[PDB]
Amino acid sequence: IAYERGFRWKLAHFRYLCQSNALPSHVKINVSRQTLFEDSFQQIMALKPYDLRRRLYVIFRGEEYGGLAREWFFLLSHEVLNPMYCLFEYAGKNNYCLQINPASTINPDHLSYFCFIGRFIAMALFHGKFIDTGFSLPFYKRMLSKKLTIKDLESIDTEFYNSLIWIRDNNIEECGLEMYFSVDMEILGKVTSHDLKLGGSNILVTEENKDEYIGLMTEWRFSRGVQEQTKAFLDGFNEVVPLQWLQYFDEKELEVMLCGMQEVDLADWQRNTVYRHYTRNSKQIIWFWQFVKETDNEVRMRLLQFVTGTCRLPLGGFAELMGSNGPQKFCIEKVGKDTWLPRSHTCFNRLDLPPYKSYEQLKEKLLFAIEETE
């Protein structure tokens, strides 16, 4: 089983853009192993952005291959995205998922650091070096200026999402709810108010501003307390790799571009998958693992991204799969009818697999869902 999205075509064109705009000579990066973040910050920020397109020449002081350019990209990526430094924070518990911290304002120069992180990530992509970022697919969708959706929201804040769904489905007027088009935000003990609409203390009614309310809350939640940080990141990035160059890609392709391919082991996956309203003896589950068997690694990764929200596997295999609520193994649940398309909840690493009537039907439906969605 294969499926071409034109990904090879996209990758080849993106790489050609980078290489055909390479600049001569080099940039020298002189750092200490124990002062890597600060040394790299200072030196990279003192350089012009286009210098970063020169070949890269890294020196670890007191030691002695790019090569250790690779070591630098590795070590520095893990340091700048370490929640220890208040710029990024783990999403839900951990999940190997990282997002911008609203309390980054704790450091008055946080925007200078986000500019540098933007440059640094762009540098990695430009030079074809892979990074272990934990950026979510909605973060990548933002880099691509793609519409963020309410399913995107479920991936970011499950209970917030669930509350908006409850509003959506229930008659709020019969319940007698009092809600207004305004939202407060507390960061580091400071409260700031935001009207979602001009003069937003202005009541939510069953309809049809509750739909309008829900969409405004959705859009507001994605950038909650991180607008300036996100702009600083994107601006720094754009200085090195124009964001427009990324428009070959969707958010899942971008994730692969940046973080690299992983070999997905079938045996490890099957052994660590749990079921709801299915067992390993359900014919849909047997078909599922037959599907996974026939398919190449690129389709496996795209299936992983669909269900878990990332192509990247935890150290320790599928047995150590995290969900936004703590450790949660890959899960497949029976829902709906053979008519339905497959769906997923990335926060729970959960595939909703309808009870399809044949192997071929399952193959066709699932391939459509993982290749033409989110």
């Binding site: 209970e159 669930n162 509350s163 769904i165 409850w166 229930n170 709810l177 809600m179 207004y180 939202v183």
Partner: protein
């Protein structure tokens, strides 16, 4: 066991509770801390409205579970 009670308005509280506690107990603690009469409160968890009489255990509300509170006019 702690549970957060959050609002779409944006304010939040933390409550110390017992898995054995009923929803009407929860709404009482909310009245204690917040001054909101339980008659005006509506609690939800995972898209489900919570009824007084049921316990926090009937829903698998656990440690650092987040309820959402809605207020009545």
């Amino acid at each position: 066991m702690h549970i957060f009670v959050k609002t779409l308005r944006g304010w939040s509280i933390t409550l110390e509770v017992e898995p054995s506690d009923t929803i009407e107990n929860v709404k009482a603690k909310i009245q204690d801390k917040e001054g909101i009469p339980p008659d005006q409160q509506i609690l939800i968890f995972a898209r489900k409205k919570l009824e007084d009489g049921r316990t926090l255990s009937d829903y698998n509300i656990q440690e650092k579970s987040s309820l959402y509170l809605f207020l009545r006019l």
